[PDB]
């Protein structure tokens, strides 16, 4: 009931909202993207961390660890904030402060 000492990593795939919705149904929203059910699961203490994807050889922020199964089940999809949807907002703020 204690978090890891050394930082951790796990490799998981992205899902299609469609396919993610096979599990979460309507709880899935526009600014949400899913990844997981592959045998690894984000869990308590991981929120606000990153789901990065290799774009053009560069790791890109694709989502922020948000929510999911209440027992960090590794068979269900993990739901992350969808950065492509919030990126506009990110920029208006950076660009204003």
């Amino acid at each position: 009931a204690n978090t890891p000492d050394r930082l951790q990593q796990a490799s998981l795939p992205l899902l299609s909202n469609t396919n993610c919705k096979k599990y979460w149904g309507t709880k899935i929203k526009d600014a949400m993207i899913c990844a997981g059910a592959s045998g690894v699961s984000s869990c308590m203490g991981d929120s606000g961390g990153p789901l990065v994807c290799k774009k053009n050889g560069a790791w890109t922020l694709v989502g922020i660890v948000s929510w999911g199964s209440s027992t960090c089940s590794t068979s269900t999809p993990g739901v992350y904030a969808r950065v492509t949807a919030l990126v506009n907002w990110v920029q208006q703020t950076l660009a204003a402060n």
């Binding site: 978090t3 869990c43 308590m44 203490g45 991981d46 948000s66 929510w67 209440s70």
Partner: protein, 58 residues
Amino acid sequence: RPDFCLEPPYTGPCKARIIRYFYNAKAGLCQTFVYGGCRAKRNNFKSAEDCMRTCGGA
């Protein structure tokens, strides 16, 4: 003694790791627990005192 004070601590679907206080009807006092960050229940306070005033000896 609102009946929510009887409810067991609720972590939630979110994945953060926040310390909150709930009311433990069995021991008659507020304890701490890890709330996930969203969709809280009412037996979940930000301080033990609030928790004591609200569910105190419920």
